[model samples]
Target: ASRLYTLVLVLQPQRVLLGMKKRGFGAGRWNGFGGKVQEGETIEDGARRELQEESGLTVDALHKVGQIVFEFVGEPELMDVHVFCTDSIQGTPVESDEMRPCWFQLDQIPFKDMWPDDSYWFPLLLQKKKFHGYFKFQGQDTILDYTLREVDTV
Candidate 1:
């Protein structure tokens, strides 16, 4: 069986909002909203649930924007990521027990506080272009491959 995860890229006016996990494997790193899919839940449902749980925001129109599939031989698992983008949402953004939500100005985003791969494709998504990408990371070094295509052209 393949495990699924969803990430939501919520767009604000001058900056994008990212949540930092207080603790866990990715603690202290800013990342788009997301979490593992619960049993019997669809990808969209997982995205919505994660958004609400992590950012206290309820999104109304989440568009499926991208996906990534990779295998970690060391962990011996096949991982799949479903990426969503939403411009229409409700509720106030706030910090939760699991995450600390913060806004970053477009030009002032703390790249150093995010996953290394975020800087590569995040800009493409923010520009309204959908894409699929894959990466293999050994420690902090990404040492594999990737591919991106515009949704419109796909």
Candidate 2:
């Protein structure tokens, strides 16, 4: 099976928003806030809705920052994710049933606690580079193969 999802990052002056999934796929790992897109909603709308629903932070203006396609070995499934980010946001980060929100400094991001593939494109995002990425995972902890490149557009 294949599905589409959206992830939104609140990139502040020196920090980024992160959340620990409390349930569902990728639960128990630190990640940017997001979830599956619902029927009739645009991808960007899904990203914004997920951010607000999960963390209570309303993005002032979301920008398409990156895209990542993840393939998990043996599952015959894949996920296509659109990544969005905003420098400005309204409201305080708050926890929800699906996730626990937290803020991490650029230099202090907990890569070991996040999805292994994130390390590949995360740096590019912080440098303000728009990127396209692909990751093949043997499991949650090992990235079997991957590709990442800064791109001019999605």
Candidate 3:
């Protein structure tokens, strides 16, 4: 079965908010704020919950911008990632045990330290274009195959 996950990005005019994973699976990687979708919740609610839990920011609305499926070699379950973006938030971001929140300017995104798939879709996201992607990874830093395309609707 595919495992559901959320990835939310807070985008302002010239900056974007990302979280540095402090521990767990993605430790040391800079990525969006999100986690698994729990069993008894809507995906959007799960997204908001994960954002608040990891970053201490609450969003009133999240724009569905993209969806990506990630496959890692030797892993049995595929990660179905629902990518969201929001320009509004209710509170200042605070760090948690799982993540450290940070804001980066548009031109200064740290792609080198992010997931290999991010660079392929982030530019499309920054441009406010909807997209869908599938990425197969041989390991953490190696992309074995991928497909990405901008779409009119997600």
Task: Give the per-residue lDDT digits (tens) of candidate 1, residues 1-154.
Answer: 5689888888777778888888776788898889889998888999999999988899878988778665554666656888888877798789998899887888887778887777777888778787777766665545466565566531
Q: Residue 103 of model 1: what lDDT?
A: 76
Quality of model 3 by C-alpha lDDT? 0.94
Off by over 4 Å in 3: none
Q: Against the true structure, what is each candidate's TM-score?
A: 0.89, 0.95, 0.98
Best by TM-score: 3
Error of 1 at 80 (Å): 1.0
Query: What lDDT tens digits, residue by residue, belong to model 2 across residues 1-154?
Result: 6788998888888898899999987899899988899999999989989998998888668999998999989987688999998988998899999999888989999988898888888898899999999999887788888989999997
Model 1 scores a C-alpha lDDT of: 0.79
lDDT of each: 0.79, 0.89, 0.94
Candidate 1 clashes: the total is 0
Lowest summed lDDT window (length 10), candidate 2: 1-10
Best-matching candidate per lDDT:
3
Model 3 error, position 117 (Å) = 0.9
Structure candidate 1, residue pairs in collision: none
Q: Give the per-residue lDDT digits (tens) of candidate 3, residues 64-95.
A: 99999999999999999999999999999999
